[PDB]
Design a protein around this ligand. Structure first.
Ligand SMILES: [Cl-]
Ligand SMILES: [Mg+2]
Ligand SMILES: [Zn+2]
Ligand SMILES: [Zn+2]
Lengths: 163, 163
């Protein structure tokens, strides 16, 4: 038995009382960009119900070309019009640099990744930087609200940041 | 006011009962690659608890360079050793091709995006394809288990797909 097995076990209970199917587009027309950090249950964090929001999470909550891609699809095909960015404190990107990280994998693997680790030092500065990354971007344009916050992994609180 | 606003309210009542902080590395040493789809509450779907699992999401659960980047970080930095891949039935990715989408964007903006929109026509198949990408990828290696499932939006049951 692995943890994949346990989660599949857990799925049997969830499926017992699943009610659906709900309609495809987000019923509150909002999309969240979050981090993949294990301490962040993005749904309970904002009281999201099923069928309501799009949630997008990667390492560091970095607005990547996959995040733009996702977002662009989200607005243009499933009619989202709000955006919430969510970095957080004690995030796992203020501990390594890109040069360090790639050299690491280079030693083992023999090659460098083409992609960019996208680490950053200060989380708050990067909520700013990530907001900007969406401002300038020409494909995520259909939104009437774009605000980015910082999740306090010690307290559960959202602290907005000004661009 | 807005949904962002409503969500923040909900965050207040979350931070009341919140117990933390927790340690960084996912306590059950697993990662999940999921879709951004509104109808998928991945945590409740696999019985996840705060601090256990990395959750990675995007449009259509595609193993883009972002997902590899996040997986390589998740494993190399925070020691995750199982991967769950998680497509689903009736995904937005099914109802368009890439060329059309980039075109629509151009006629609207004047620009073709640089990224591949990454649609697919068969969910069950592209699980194998997504599994196949991680398999042959030289930066996602430390994992012991790799399995892929299809979440059924109408029942809530997973359906394991095999390579
Ligand atoms: Cl999530
Ligand atoms: Mg913009
Ligand atoms: Zn993080
Ligand atoms: Zn989807």
């Amino acid at each position: 038995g692995t943890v994949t097995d346990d989660y599949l076990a857990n799925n049997v209970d969830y499926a017992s009382g699943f009610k659906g199917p709900l309609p495809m587009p987000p019923s509150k027309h909002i999309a969240i960009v979050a981090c993949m950090d294990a301490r962040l249950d993005v749904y309970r964090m904002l009281g999201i119900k099923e069928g309501e929001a799009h949630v997008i999470r990667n390492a560091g909550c970095v607005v990547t070309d996959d995040v733009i891609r996702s977002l662009a699809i989200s607005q243009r095909l499933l009619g989202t019009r709000e955006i919430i960015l969510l970095h957080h404190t004690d995030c796992g990107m203020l501990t390594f640099t890109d040069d360090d990280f790639k050299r690491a994998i280079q030693d083992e693997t023999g090659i460098r990744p083409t992609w960019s680790p996208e680490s950053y030092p200060d989380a708050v500065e990067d909520v700013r930087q990530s907001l900007r990354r969406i401002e300038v971007n020409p494909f995520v344009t259909k939104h009437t609200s774009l605000r980015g916050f910082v999740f306090d992994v010690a307290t559960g609180k959202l602290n907005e940041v000004t661009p």
